[PDB]
Amino acid sequence: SLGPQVAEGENVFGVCHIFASFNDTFVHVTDLSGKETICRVTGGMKVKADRDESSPYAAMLAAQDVAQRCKELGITALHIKLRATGGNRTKTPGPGAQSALRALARSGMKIGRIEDVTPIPSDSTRRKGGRRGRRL
């Protein structure tokens, strides 16, 4: 796999786009622009049980593979963008947010920056569940 012709003293910086919350974890490594991208792995692909897709180790096992293919190509460092679901929903990270970072960093990849990005309305449309909401 052909990387760029220098990366010896510099690094090449990708964006990691970690997805958060329940019943799902994505890790989707992209360009700086985000226009084009590389491999994309889910916790539903590592673990099949339909109930461990949000688990810590399923998120770790995902990033443990994705981080190999990064360095295989020539992407060595990562800026990080987070995404919790939002849009008048839970708007809080899942379990597999803390998890994937700890695994991918110690696999050998560099971390450049980290930030929160979540789609938060300035007040928008009514939430599913009705007036009385879920119970049981």
Binding site: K48, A49, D50, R51
Partner: protein, 266 residues
């Protein structure tokens, strides 16, 4: 011995097992979709809903369809799961289980006579014969049964590669006994409503001409079910060669009867 083309299962493949014990942590089970190798099922990945009873689900002495989730190739630990199973997969796996049983029973007659004092005997027969039959036609969805079924109806398939002895008679007998009698569901649909009195002899000329370009001595099966309906089960091949026999014959009877008086059903 092995019932399957590969000795060890892969990853995400549908298989069959037979329960021999029930574990605390799931179910330890023997395969009968491969060798008698061990595979472990786990309790968590059996269903997505509660479980009151436990012997009204899995119990000993049951064929159960399952998916191989992981395998340790070197150690021989076949991790297993029953969580992802659809009834469509069960139909596909039951067929492959049943077809392998009959094919291995054919490849047991071979071992009745030859040196089989050691268990590995059938393994020797299996690898050399089975693979060249099924590998050539696995990509199109055929098992080694297709290759043998083709040999009985046209013998060049089993003469294209090493032909065994005494096998050929039992092979022919078992193919021709079990996969026949062998069959035509050809029935003619004919409707007539004559004002004729010469219709009785008119029909006789029409009946004997069910297949054009055949000898006058051709045996056929005439059937009378009702007065206007004339059913002729035409020459019995496989119903993919007697299509012209069925279609064009219907035109004969309806045409022959209109010439002798009045209008009829077409």
């Amino acid at each position: 011995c092995r019932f399957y083309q590969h000795k060890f299962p892969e990853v995400e493949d549908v298989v069959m097992v037979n329960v021999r014990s029930i574990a605390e942590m799931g179910a330890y089970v023997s395969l009968l979709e491969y060798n008698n190798i061990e595979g472990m099922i786990l309790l968590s990945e059996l269903s997505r809903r509660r479980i009151r009873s436990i012997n009204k689900l899995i119990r000993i002495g049951r064929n159960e369809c399952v998916v191989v989730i992981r395998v340790d190739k070197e150690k021989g630990y076949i991790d297993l799961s029953k969580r992802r199973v659809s009834p469509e997969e069960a139909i596909k796996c039951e067929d492959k289980f049943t077809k392998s049983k009959t094919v291995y029973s054919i490849l047991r007659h071979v071992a009745e006579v030859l040196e089989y004092t050691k268990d590995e005997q059938l393994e020797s027969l299996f690898q050399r014969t089975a693979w060249v039959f099924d590998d050539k036609y696995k990509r199109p969805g055929y098992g080694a049964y297709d290759a043998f079924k083709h040999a009985v109806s046209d013998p060049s398939i089993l003469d294209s590669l090493d032909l065994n002895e005494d096998e050929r008679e039992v092979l022919i007998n078992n193919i021709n006994r079990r996969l026949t009698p062998q069959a035509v569901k050809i029935r003619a649909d004919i409707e007539v409503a004559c004002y004729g009195y010469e219709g009785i002899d008119a029909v006789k000329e029409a009946l004997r001409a069910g297949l054009n370009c055949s000898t006058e001595t051709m045996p056929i099966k005439i059937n009378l079910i009702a007065p206007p309906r004339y059913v002729m089960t035409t020459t019995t091949l496989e119903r993919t060669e007697g299509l012209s026999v069925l279609n064009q014959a219907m035109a004969v009877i309806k045409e022959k009867i209109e010439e002798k008086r009045g209008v009829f059903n077409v």
